[PDB]
Swiss-Prot record, chains A, B:
Official protein name in the record: Pyridoxal kinase PdxY
Alphabetical UniProt keywords: ATP-binding, Kinase, Magnesium, Nucleotide-binding, Transferase
A Gene Ontology BP annotation from the UniProt entry: pyridoxal 5'-phosphate salvage
UniProt organism field: Escherichia coli (strain K12)
EC primary class: transferase
A Pfam cross-reference name: Phos_pyr_kin
Lineage: Bacteria, Pseudomonadati, Pseudomonadota, Gammaproteobacteria, Enterobacterales
Keyword Kinase: yes
CDD domains xrefs: pyridoxal_pyridoxamine_kinase (cd01173)
Annotated ATP binding sites: 112, 144, 149, 182, 209-212
Pathway linked to the protein: Cofactor metabolism; pyridoxal 5'-phosphate salvage; pyridoxal 5'-phosphate from pyridoxal: step 1/1
EC number: 2.7.1.35
Annotated HAMAP family: PdxY
Length: 287, 287
């Protein structure tokens, strides 16, 4: 009884980012992924250049009508969206979630509010952030912002774990039942490691792993993998703790392989056996 | 060094066919796949209906210009083409193959001349067939036609295994060094078995496996998976016999899992472990 996820995000022909980074790892974990690509780019934006195009918003709507047309929309367990090529796609993606839920009221909407962080190298189109803030957030059942996005969504700064657990709950209040702060940064207990947070209304778990020295060029996609894998674990019945721990270790595995190979692109394929069964163990802490 | 394959063929959001059928198994076997999708369809054409779009020919070329721009083309080890959305995509693909070859002279063009049966089978645009006999064939280093495609490519009927090895070699005289007759059908020893042929100027190998009964609804993508895995096997050093034995066993596992699950869509994900490590053994015969 495999889980089916309609993942609506970017696709790069060369390299990994969005669906190009998330799809394979998710399938290696035994889940089905229906990749509805939002763009088809030659490579990701951190290169400072890339060719390709943005799928028109109406194309995305037309794709799902086709899936409904063959009577399969009801088999979808979740809709995950991530990097959008334009703000107008957002609106159609919400119509999609509405249709998916009409066909399956248990389907969940997983919103990874990928906003543009030009300094880190991620280029996102204008209007996309406002979309997450005013429409995406309220419509989501699960949301996964990094620290910056958290601030943009709750509309105020966050400077520690306590404030993060609080800010997350401000979002939960607006709709999502689960919040994944996929990168605490300065707001974590230690800024010398990688920290994440998985918060619900009644509970909150903390996890961390070591930062991997990549210098002036961190590999794109860590957060897309993290989001993809988390949705997969939860849909499969993993507890909040189990989900967080497996996901943290698997990503670290991809991390070390990528660095060992002296590669800039996340090595999701080479590290595949350790995504399924990672060898490193990282402990979560219930706050 | 992990092998890199630029695969130019279809993408379906729901289901498996083209890159959506071949990509996962290829990566599962440890190769990288750069998927340059020739279309983004809701499902495969054999449902009798679908939505989505064809990528414009120029789109295929600009994507590759993009990969060249970041200086990565030279890492491409092979260009694989399969289902094309239009006849003009073919021309651009041959431009792509020359570009990849100028950057990496050892790179190979693998042509799976999908011509379809636009009536009772696979729905392919008019003129694609013509592109294959005219250009695909002579530009290709490896070509994998099924029985109908072979007859069309050599311009004559083929009625048994020996005429097939013969027709394959008439193609080799036109350009490729390797021919995979991906399904012998009526031209094999028996129609009660799935047969294939891997042929070169000096040798030829025949292999068979049991048929898997799906009634009237025959799963799509078996040929796409077979070609991709053969390319991966060959690029990573397998002998003709090794390549053929592994690909035949692996595809068979996918088929038995598809049947056991009573699925119409090739279960390339459910059977992933038996793709890398098949539990069935099929012996190839050197003619
Ligand atoms: C044939 O149904 C088909 C192929 C051939 O495997 C590849 N892509 C698509 C979309 C279709 O329909
Ligand atoms: C194309 C593309 N898609 C997704 C992301 C990050 O989720 C990036 C980050 O740079 C990107 O460039």
């Amino acid at each position: 009884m495999m889980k089916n996820i309609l993942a609506i995000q970017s696709h790069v022909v060369y390299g990994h980012a969005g669906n190009s980074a998330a799809e394979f790892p998710m399938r290696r974990l035994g889940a089905n992924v229906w990749p509805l690509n939002t763009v088809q780019f030659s490579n990701h934006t951190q290169y400072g250049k890339w060719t390709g195009c943005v799928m028109p918003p109406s194309h995305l709507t037309e794709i799902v009508q086709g899936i409904a047309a063959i009577d399969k929309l009801h088999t979808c367990d979740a809709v995950l969206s991530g990097y959008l090529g334009s703000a107008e796609q957002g609106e159609h993606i919400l119509g999609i979630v509405r249709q998916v839920k009409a066909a399956n009221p248990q389907a969940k909407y997983f919103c990874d509010p990928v906003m543009g962080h030009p300094e880190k190298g991620c280029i996102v189109a204008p209007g996309v952030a406002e979309f997450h803030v005013r429409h995406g957030l309220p419509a989501s059942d699960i949301i996964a912002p990094n620290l910056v996005e958290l601030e943009i969504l709750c509309e105020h700064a966050v400077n520690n774990v306590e404030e993060a657990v609080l800010a997350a709950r401000e979002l939960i209040a607006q709709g999502p039942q689960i919040v994944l702060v996929k990168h605490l940064a300065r707001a974590g207990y230690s800024r010398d490691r990688f920290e994440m947070l998985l918060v619900t209304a009644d509970e909150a778990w903390h996890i961390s792993r070591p930062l991997v020295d990549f210098g002036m060029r961190q590999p794109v996609g860590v957060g897309d993998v993290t989001s993809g894998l988390l949705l997969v674990k939860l849909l499969q019945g993993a507890t909040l703790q189990e989900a967080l721990e497996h996901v943290t270790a698997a990503v670290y595995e991809i991390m070390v392989t990528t660095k060992a190979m002296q590669e800039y692109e996340l090595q999701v394929v080479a590290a595949q056996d350790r995504i399924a069964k990672p060898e490193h163990y990282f402990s979560a802490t219930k706050l």
